[PDB]
Design a protein around this ligand. Structure first.
Ligand SMILES: [Mg+2]
Ligand SMILES: [Mg+2]
Ligand SMILES: [Mg+2]
Lengths: 95, 141, 109, 52, 324, 49, 41, 80
RNA sequence: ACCUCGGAGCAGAACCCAACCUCCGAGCAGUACAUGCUAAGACUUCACCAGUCAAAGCGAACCUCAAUUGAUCCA
């Protein structure tokens, strides 16, 4: 990525990352599964049910996506009727 | 009140308790092997050379209710202990014996030739007309 | 002139050895042909994989194999046997740990 | 040899689903299940999507 | 590294050199028979069972059936399969001959012996008959293991049995509210002359059965005792509680059990009447509570799980707002 | 939160509570860039209000 | 109005459905009879 | 207390006194709860809605029990 | 000559194990149209991506085969 831009001297986000992923405020990245809309005629319904899911990301995938976006994308967002809003705070972890 | 000192956890040690709430486990497994062990009560017909025999069992193999023709009460009113009349007779007798045992649901699983025998169709018609449903309610999870 | 044969290991075999506590739905063992058969409280997938249907402890036994009468392969294998000959297989059982619920006092009406 | 066709529901409409059928046999009509009507309904095939 | 088998291996003795000289299972059914026999035998490997477990009679019977098959309508009816059986004769003669062993099976299956006598099995020789009055027309009979409502069992039953002293006992093997071991009796009539019941010393008088709501299905024991020498004995549920084992231990010298009939009860509205009216307490209501579902330990990064994973581990389904 | 602000003198309930009074009591920080369109009341703490 | 036209159209087609199913299964039996009659030759 | 409730009609008090008899106390009190929310407004509203549902429905697993009752009546076929 | 996928030996008994090592194969076909929708718990080709299995539930009846395949963007 660009660590220091030529105009501002700031970091830049990679906009592929924003275009594909969802950062929850607790640090979890949500994604969509690869091939969830390809060749559905030859996939069993169990597999199609698996592909139509919002799948969390790895730890190192998560840290790779944190480094590729900026602090704007890491921020609390109090939207109006947000579908994912109950998934931001992390309930009831025992580490 | 001394009278209403109730333990917070009721203990019912009726063996047939959980099976009559249709809550108790059936042995779900055994899919490569005949017959299925998934029942609470099984009706097992034993047709020997000479005698027709009818059992009602648990999964334990504890025979709950039997009716054989090797029994003077039923044998003497019969012509031959092995024919279709023997099976209709042992179906009436078995069904009447099972209503008074508080058993209302068996499973009968025959081989596909014993299914299409006349004497077991007559046995099943005797059981169903007697008052016993030959199909268990599902387990409530 | 020997092309192909570069397939990797399937990583099959037993996942829960005997004595292991097992929760409901755990895969006990994945096989490619029936090395182990489902016994008490053990289910089978389309891939011949043995999973668990109750929570309990896995046990392996040796039992009499009596196939379903509509299974003409194994049934035709039966009728060729001599008169004492009885087939055995190894089965997998889950001995269920918990009771399936208790009665508890709710209210003194 | 086979064709992937779409099947359009006759009622509770706008519902399609794809099937395979031979190049040579007739135009399929089926009884599939509409989750919009939530019933089994005749579907009629309307367009071949791809000759697999 | 082979270790040799402990006992004999199966399929050893039949394993010969000439299989084609050995006659085979032509069928499926014979293999199922032999196979079940080998299932029931004790083995040395680990099996499923380890973990989840006079002359005048034959004379009159031979002449009786020989006279029975000789009639032409019996043969003609039986070959046209329109012959039937009188169920009543079979019922009463079953009450006479081999009924006691079958009532022994039903008492062993319903756990009356492991609970009522700590495993001391016996045989109910006396064909006892108990029935509850259902109005004035008909009456609900008590056979071994029946279902009878506590409305039908509101009033003390009619007891008839063909015999010649006696002590009759009713208990509720499971209906005890406090102790998981004892049982509330319902009526204990003693020193009974012959086969009339009313002239018995009513020591503990009749309660109806009271199973609590949602506490499952209860079994209720009618013991009937051969008494030799007439002995003297002895709505508070601290007073209806005893155990039939160590009760019978005090009196087993000149008294032996001779009759059973037991039945099931569930809740009914009459049991509301029993708890409120004549016991004078609030009724306890039970519910069958299943154990909470296993979920594994929650991870920081639940890799590849769906988004539903975060809901397995929450406890409120309402928007929490935190410090704001 | 708002009961908390009223108890500690930071928001005077004997006057109208506009958004300026929640800002000047520093009860709520709202930033119009980052496109906050204001405050939403939240049912948390409805009992004991 | 969009919702009413869709809902009305679905309700009409569903009113016409069971007759179309019975006609369809009769056509299936014609494929049974004609198929098996073509099997004989 | 269901018996003294002037604000429910007498036939509706009988229908409630019969259908919801498993909620009625020893003291004749219809008792009904809600633990569906963290907010006691929403649980109180759930309780009151249960009551209004009982009056509107009162103004205007079973299968096993059907069979066990039919067989209990087949053994009831025993007169004097 | 090959390049991807699967079976067997090497690699004898949990898993894994190479080679321009030894032998077979695959790039489909057939049936069904609830091959619907949901969902505990798991396995996993040594990562990831992909893959697999699945009870309970709602709704209904009363898939075989080993491989049988192709990401993203764009149309
Ligand atoms: Mg290989
Ligand atoms: Mg390799
Ligand atoms: Mg791995």
């Amino acid at each position: 990525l660009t660590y220091f831009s030529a105009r501002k001297g700031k970091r830049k986000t990679v906009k592929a990352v924003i275009d594909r992923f969802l950062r929850l405020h607790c640090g979890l990245w949500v994604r969509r599964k690869a091939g969830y809309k390809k060749k559905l005629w030859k996939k069993t319904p169990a597999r199609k049910k698996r592909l139509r899911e919002f799948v969390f990301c790895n730890k190192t995938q998560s840290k790779l996506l944190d480094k590729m976006t900026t602090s704007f994308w890491k921020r609390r967002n109090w939207y109006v009727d947000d579908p994912y809003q109950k998934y931001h705070d992390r309930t009831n972890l025992k580490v | 009140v001394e009278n209403e000192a109730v333990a917070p956890e009721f203990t019912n040690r009726n063996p047939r308790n959980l099976e009559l709430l249709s809550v108790a486990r059936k042995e779900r497994g055994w899919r490569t092997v005949f017959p299925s062990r998934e029942f609470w009560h099984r009706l097992r017909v034993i047709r020997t050379q000479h005698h027709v025999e009818a059992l009602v069992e648990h999964q334990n193999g504890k025979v709950v209710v039997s009716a054989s023709t090797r029994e003077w009460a039923i044998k003497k009113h019969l012509y031959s202990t092995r024919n279709v009349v023997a099976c209709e007779s042992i179906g009436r007798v078995l069904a009447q014996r099972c209503l008074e045992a508080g058993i209302n649901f068996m499973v009968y699983q025959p081989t596909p030739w014993e299914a299409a025998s006349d004497s077991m169709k007559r046995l099943q018609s005797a059981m169903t007309e007697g008052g016993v449903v030959l199909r268990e309610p599902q387990r409530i999870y | 002139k020997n092309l192909g044969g570069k397939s990797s290991g399937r990583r099959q075999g037993i996942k829960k050895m005997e004595g292991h506590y097992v929760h409901a739905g755990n895969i006990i063992a994945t096989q490619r042909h029936f090395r182990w058969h489902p016994g008490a409280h053990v289910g089978v997938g389309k891939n011949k994989c043995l999973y668990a249907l109750e929570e309990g402890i896995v046990r392996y036994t040796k039992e009499v194999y009596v196939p379903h009468p509509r299974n003409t392969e194994a049934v035709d294998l039966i009728t060729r046997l001599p008169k004492g000959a009885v087939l055995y297989k190894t089965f997998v059982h889950v001995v269920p740990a918990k009771p399936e619920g208790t009665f508890k006092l709710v209210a003194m009406l | 040899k086979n064709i992937l066709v779409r099947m359009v529901s006759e009622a509770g409409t706008g519902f399609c689903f794809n099937t395979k059928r031979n190049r040579l046999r007739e135009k399929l009509t089926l009884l599939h299940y509409d989750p919009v009507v939530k019933q089994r309904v005749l579907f009629v095939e309307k367009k071949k999507i791809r000759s697999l | 590294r082979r270790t040799p088998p402990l006992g004999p291996m199966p399929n050893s003795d039949i394993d010969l050199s000439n299989l084609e000289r050995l006659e085979k299972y032509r069928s499926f059914d014979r293999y199922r028979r032999r196979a079940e026999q080998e299932a029931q035998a004790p083995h040395w490997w680990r099996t499923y069972r380890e973990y989840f477990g006079r002359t005048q009679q034959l004379l009159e019977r031979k002449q009786a059936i020989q006279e029975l098959r000789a009639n032409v309508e019996e043969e003609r009816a039986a070959r046209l399969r329109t012959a039937s059986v009188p169920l009543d004769a079979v019922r009463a003669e079953w009450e006479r001959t081999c009924g006691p062993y079958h009532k022994q099976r039903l008492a062993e299956y319903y756990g009356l012996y492991r609970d009522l006598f700590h495993g001391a099995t016996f045989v109910p020789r006396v064909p006892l008959h108990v029935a509850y009055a259902v109005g004035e027309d008909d009456l609900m009979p008590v056979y071994c293991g029946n279902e009878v409502t506590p409305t039908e069992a509101a009033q003390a039953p009619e007891v008839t049995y063909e015999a010649e002293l006696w002590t009759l006992l009713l208990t509720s093997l499971d209906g005890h509210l406090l102790e998981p071991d004892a049982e509330y009796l319902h009526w204990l009539l003693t020193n009974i002359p012959g086969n009339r019941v009313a002239e018995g010393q009513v020591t503990c008088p009749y309660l109806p059965p009271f199973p609590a709501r949602g506490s499952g299905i209860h079994r209720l024991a009618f013991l009937l005792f051969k008494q030799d020498q007439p002995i003297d004995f002895s709505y508070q549920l601290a007073q209806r509680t005893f155990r039939t084992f160590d009760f019978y231990k005090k009196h087993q010298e000149t008294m032996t059990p001779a009759g059973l009939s037991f039945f099931q009860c569930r809740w009914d509205d009459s049991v509301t009447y029993i708890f409120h009216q004549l016991l004078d307490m609030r009724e306890p209501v039970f519910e069958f509570v299943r154990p909470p579902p296993y979920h594994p330990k929650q991870k920081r990064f639940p890799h590849r799980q769906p988004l539903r994973y975060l809901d397995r581990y929450r406890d409120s389904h309402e928007p929490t707002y935190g410090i704001y | 939160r708002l009961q908390y602000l009223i108890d500690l003198g930071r928001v005077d309930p004997s006057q109208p509570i506009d958004l300026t009074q929640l800002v000047n009591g520093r009860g709520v920080t709202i930033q119009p860039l980052k496109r906050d369109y204001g405050v939403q009341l939240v049912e948390e703490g409805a009992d004991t209000f | 109005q969009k919702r009413r036209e869709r809902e009305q159209h679905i309700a009409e087609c569903m009113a016409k459905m069971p007759q179309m199913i019975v006609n369809w299964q009769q056509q299936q039996r014609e494929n049974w009879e004609k198929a098996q009659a073509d099997k004989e030759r | 207390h269901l018996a003294t409730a002037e604000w429910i009609a007498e036939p509706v008090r009988q229908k409630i006194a019969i259908t919801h008899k498993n909620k009625i106390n020893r003291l004749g009190e219809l008792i009904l709860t809600s633990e569906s929310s963290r907010y006691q407004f929403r649980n109180l509203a759930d309780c009151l809605q249960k009551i209004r549902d009982m009056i509107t429905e009162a103004s205007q697993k079973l299968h096993r029990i059907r069979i066990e009752n039919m067989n209990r009546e087949r053994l009831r076929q025993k007169r004097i």
